[PDB]
Design a protein around this nucleic acid. Structure first.
Ligand SMILES: [Zn+2]
Ligand SMILES: [Zn+2]
Ligand SMILES: [Zn+2]
Ligand SMILES: [Zn+2]
Lengths: 94, 101
DNA sequence: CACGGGTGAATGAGGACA
DNA sequence: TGTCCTCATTCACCCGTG
Protein backbone atom coordinates (compact mmCIF):
# COMPACT_ATOMS: atom_id res chain seq x y z
CA UNK A 1 0.00 0.00 0.00
CA UNK A 2 2.19 2.80 -1.50
CA UNK A 3 1.09 5.85 0.51
CA UNK A 4 3.49 7.52 2.92
CA UNK A 5 2.54 6.82 6.51
CA UNK A 6 3.80 10.16 7.59
CA UNK A 7 2.44 12.73 5.23
CA UNK A 8 0.27 10.81 2.83
CA UNK A 9 2.24 11.73 -0.30
CA UNK A 10 2.99 8.99 -2.81
CA UNK A 11 5.26 6.37 -1.21
CA UNK A 12 8.40 5.05 -2.98
CA UNK A 13 8.74 2.11 -0.58
CA UNK A 14 10.06 1.18 2.84
CA UNK A 15 12.61 3.45 4.37
CA UNK A 16 14.14 2.90 7.78
CA UNK A 17 11.42 0.31 8.29
CA UNK A 18 8.28 2.08 7.04
CA UNK A 19 6.36 2.91 3.88
CA UNK A 20 7.43 6.49 3.26
CA UNK A 21 7.86 9.13 0.54
CA UNK A 22 11.20 10.43 -0.57
CA UNK A 23 10.67 13.55 1.48
CA UNK A 24 10.05 11.80 4.71
CA UNK A 25 13.01 9.44 4.37
CA UNK A 26 15.21 12.44 3.78
CA UNK A 27 13.62 14.48 6.48
CA UNK A 28 13.85 11.63 8.95
CA UNK A 29 17.48 10.69 8.34
CA UNK A 30 18.78 14.23 8.47
CA UNK A 31 16.79 14.97 11.50
CA UNK A 32 18.11 11.95 13.38
CA UNK A 33 21.69 12.54 12.32
CA UNK A 34 21.97 16.19 13.19
CA UNK A 35 20.18 15.21 16.41
CA UNK A 36 17.58 17.97 15.81
CA UNK A 37 15.39 19.35 18.54
CA UNK A 38 12.03 20.42 17.18
CA UNK A 39 9.02 22.08 18.86
CA UNK A 40 5.43 22.45 17.76
CA UNK A 41 4.52 26.03 17.25
CA UNK A 42 0.88 24.84 17.63
CA UNK A 43 -0.57 21.99 19.75
CA UNK A 44 1.75 19.13 19.02
CA UNK A 45 -0.84 17.13 17.16
CA UNK A 46 -0.58 18.54 13.66
CA UNK A 47 -2.14 16.53 10.86
CA UNK A 48 0.74 16.05 8.41
CA UNK A 49 -0.02 16.30 4.72
CA UNK A 50 1.90 16.45 1.49
CA UNK A 51 1.39 20.19 1.58
CA UNK A 52 2.12 21.08 5.13
CA UNK A 53 4.90 18.67 6.20
CA UNK A 54 7.53 21.27 5.42
CA UNK A 55 6.14 23.31 8.26
CA UNK A 56 5.75 21.38 11.41
CA UNK A 57 8.99 19.51 11.78
CA UNK A 58 8.34 18.59 15.36
CA UNK A 59 5.17 16.71 14.51
CA UNK A 60 6.45 15.35 11.27
CA UNK A 61 9.38 13.88 13.12
CA UNK A 62 7.33 12.51 16.07
CA UNK A 63 5.13 11.04 13.40
CA UNK A 64 8.03 9.14 11.78
CA UNK A 65 8.90 7.71 15.08
CA UNK A 66 5.31 6.70 15.80
CA UNK A 67 4.79 4.75 12.52
CA UNK A 68 7.95 2.88 13.33
CA UNK A 69 10.80 4.38 11.40
CA UNK A 70 14.00 3.36 13.15
CA UNK A 71 17.08 5.58 13.53
CA UNK A 72 19.07 2.37 13.99
CA UNK A 73 18.68 1.62 10.28
CA UNK A 74 20.48 4.84 9.35
CA UNK A 75 24.14 4.00 8.68
CA UNK A 76 26.66 5.85 10.90
CA UNK A 77 29.56 7.83 9.50
CA UNK A 78 32.13 5.18 10.32
CA UNK A 79 29.79 2.74 8.60
CA UNK A 80 29.36 4.88 5.48
CA UNK A 81 33.07 5.44 5.24
CA UNK A 82 33.95 1.76 5.51
CA UNK A 83 31.45 1.32 2.72
CA UNK A 84 33.02 3.97 0.44
CA UNK A 85 36.23 2.06 1.32
CA UNK A 86 34.89 -0.94 -0.53
CA UNK A 87 33.03 0.87 -3.31
CA UNK A 88 36.59 1.86 -4.32
CA UNK A 89 38.25 -1.20 -2.73
CA UNK A 90 36.02 -3.01 -5.24
CA UNK A 91 36.46 -0.54 -8.15
CA UNK A 92 40.16 -1.42 -7.46
CA UNK A 93 39.43 -5.15 -7.00
CA UNK A 94 37.93 -4.82 -10.53
CA UNK B 1 0.30 31.40 -8.99
CA UNK B 2 2.49 34.48 -8.08
CA UNK B 3 1.16 37.98 -7.30
CA UNK B 4 1.10 38.99 -3.64
CA UNK B 5 -2.23 38.26 -2.06
CA UNK B 6 -2.04 41.12 0.37
CA UNK B 7 -0.84 43.98 -1.72
CA UNK B 8 -1.30 42.82 -5.28
CA UNK B 9 2.42 43.31 -6.09
CA UNK B 10 4.65 40.52 -7.62
CA UNK B 11 5.35 37.82 -5.01
CA UNK B 12 8.66 36.07 -4.44
CA UNK B 13 7.09 32.91 -2.99
CA UNK B 14 5.23 31.69 0.04
CA UNK B 15 5.93 33.60 3.23
CA UNK B 16 4.61 32.47 6.58
CA UNK B 17 2.27 30.42 4.46
CA UNK B 18 0.86 32.76 1.82
CA UNK B 19 2.05 33.85 -1.61
CA UNK B 20 3.29 37.41 -0.95
CA UNK B 21 5.62 40.20 -2.14
CA UNK B 22 8.94 40.66 -0.40
CA UNK B 23 7.52 43.74 1.32
CA UNK B 24 4.49 42.13 2.96
CA UNK B 25 6.69 39.32 4.22
CA UNK B 26 8.74 42.04 5.89
CA UNK B 27 5.74 44.01 7.13
CA UNK B 28 4.01 40.93 8.55
CA UNK B 29 7.01 39.68 10.46
CA UNK B 30 7.76 43.06 12.05
CA UNK B 31 4.16 43.68 13.04
CA UNK B 32 3.66 40.33 14.78
CA UNK B 33 7.03 40.54 16.39
CA UNK B 34 5.90 43.75 18.17
CA UNK B 35 2.37 42.58 18.94
CA UNK B 36 1.69 45.90 17.31
CA UNK B 37 -2.01 46.72 17.57
CA UNK B 38 -3.14 48.98 14.78
CA UNK B 39 -6.20 51.10 14.26
CA UNK B 40 -7.48 52.19 10.88
CA UNK B 41 -7.66 55.97 10.07
CA UNK B 42 -10.60 55.40 7.75
CA UNK B 43 -13.41 52.81 7.82
CA UNK B 44 -11.79 49.40 8.42
CA UNK B 45 -12.35 48.44 4.78
CA UNK B 46 -9.24 49.81 2.92
CA UNK B 47 -8.75 48.24 -0.51
CA UNK B 48 -4.98 47.42 -0.50
CA UNK B 49 -2.56 47.91 -3.36
CA UNK B 50 1.12 47.96 -4.27
CA UNK B 51 0.77 51.67 -3.61
CA UNK B 52 -1.47 52.78 -0.73
CA UNK B 53 0.14 49.81 1.00
CA UNK B 54 2.30 51.57 3.63
CA UNK B 55 -0.62 53.84 4.53
CA UNK B 56 -2.91 51.59 6.59
CA UNK B 57 -0.97 49.26 8.82
CA UNK B 58 -4.22 48.26 10.39
CA UNK B 59 -5.93 47.07 7.28
CA UNK B 60 -2.78 45.65 5.71
CA UNK B 61 -2.10 43.56 8.78
CA UNK B 62 -5.73 42.40 8.96
CA UNK B 63 -5.64 41.56 5.26
CA UNK B 64 -2.44 39.50 5.84
CA UNK B 65 -4.25 37.26 8.28
CA UNK B 66 -7.27 36.64 6.02
CA UNK B 67 -4.90 35.74 3.15
CA UNK B 68 -3.56 33.09 5.52
CA UNK B 69 -0.32 34.30 7.07
CA UNK B 70 0.75 32.93 10.36
CA UNK B 71 2.53 34.50 13.21
CA UNK B 72 3.40 30.91 14.26
CA UNK B 73 5.84 30.61 11.36
CA UNK B 74 7.71 33.76 12.38
CA UNK B 75 10.68 32.42 14.35
CA UNK B 76 10.93 33.24 18.06
CA UNK B 77 13.97 35.05 19.48
CA UNK B 78 14.89 31.80 21.17
CA UNK B 79 14.68 29.82 17.96
CA UNK B 80 16.75 32.39 16.11
CA UNK B 81 19.52 32.11 18.63
CA UNK B 82 19.66 28.32 18.55
CA UNK B 83 20.20 28.85 14.82
CA UNK B 84 23.12 31.34 14.87
CA UNK B 85 24.66 28.86 17.36
CA UNK B 86 23.71 25.67 15.42
CA UNK B 87 25.48 27.47 12.55
CA UNK B 88 28.69 27.66 14.65
CA UNK B 89 28.74 24.17 16.18
CA UNK B 90 28.42 22.44 12.79
CA UNK B 91 31.09 25.00 11.81
CA UNK B 92 33.57 23.67 14.37
CA UNK B 93 32.56 20.10 13.50
CA UNK B 94 33.41 20.68 9.83
CA UNK B 95 36.72 22.05 11.16
CA UNK B 96 37.59 19.01 13.32
CA UNK B 97 36.27 16.75 10.53
CA UNK B 98 38.82 18.48 8.28
CA UNK B 99 41.89 17.93 10.53
CA UNK B 100 41.44 14.14 10.78
CA UNK B 101 41.69 13.91 6.93
C1' DC C 1 13.90 -5.09 -7.61
C1' DA C 2 14.44 -2.83 -2.83
C1' DC C 3 16.69 0.51 -0.11
C1' DG C 4 20.87 2.40 1.82
C1' DG C 5 23.48 7.20 0.68
C1' DG C 6 24.31 11.51 -1.95
C1' DT C 7 23.61 15.64 -4.86
C1' DG C 8 21.95 20.10 -6.24
C1' DA C 9 18.50 23.45 -7.58
C1' DA C 10 14.59 25.48 -5.41
C1' DT C 11 12.38 27.13 -0.86
C1' DG C 12 11.87 30.36 2.50
C1' DA C 13 13.55 31.98 7.18
C1' DG C 14 16.13 36.31 8.96
C1' DG C 15 18.89 40.68 8.45
C1' DA C 16 21.81 44.91 6.74
C1' DC C 17 20.95 48.97 4.91
C1' DA C 18 19.42 52.93 1.83
C1' DT D 1 9.87 50.04 4.22
C1' DG D 2 11.50 47.02 1.16
C1' DT D 3 15.34 45.34 -1.26
C1' DC D 4 18.52 41.88 -2.00
C1' DC D 5 21.78 38.75 -0.03
C1' DT D 6 23.03 34.46 3.13
C1' DC D 7 22.28 30.06 4.33
C1' DA D 8 19.80 25.93 6.22
C1' DT D 9 16.29 22.60 4.59
C1' DT D 10 13.78 20.07 1.33
C1' DC D 11 13.04 16.35 -2.09
C1' DA D 12 13.20 14.38 -6.89
C1' DC D 13 16.48 11.45 -8.80
C1' DC D 14 20.19 9.06 -9.30
C1' DC D 15 24.14 5.44 -7.93
C1' DG D 16 25.57 0.99 -5.93
C1' DT D 17 25.16 -3.21 -2.79
C1' DG D 18 22.31 -7.00 -1.51
ZN1 LIG E 1 5.82 11.50 3.50
ZN1 LIG F 1 2.99 20.32 15.19
ZN1 LIG G 1 2.59 42.55 -0.98
ZN1 LIG H 1 -7.73 51.06 6.91
Amino acid sequence: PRICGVCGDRATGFHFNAMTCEGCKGFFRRSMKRKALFTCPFNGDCRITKDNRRHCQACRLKRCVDIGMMKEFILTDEEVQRKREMILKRKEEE
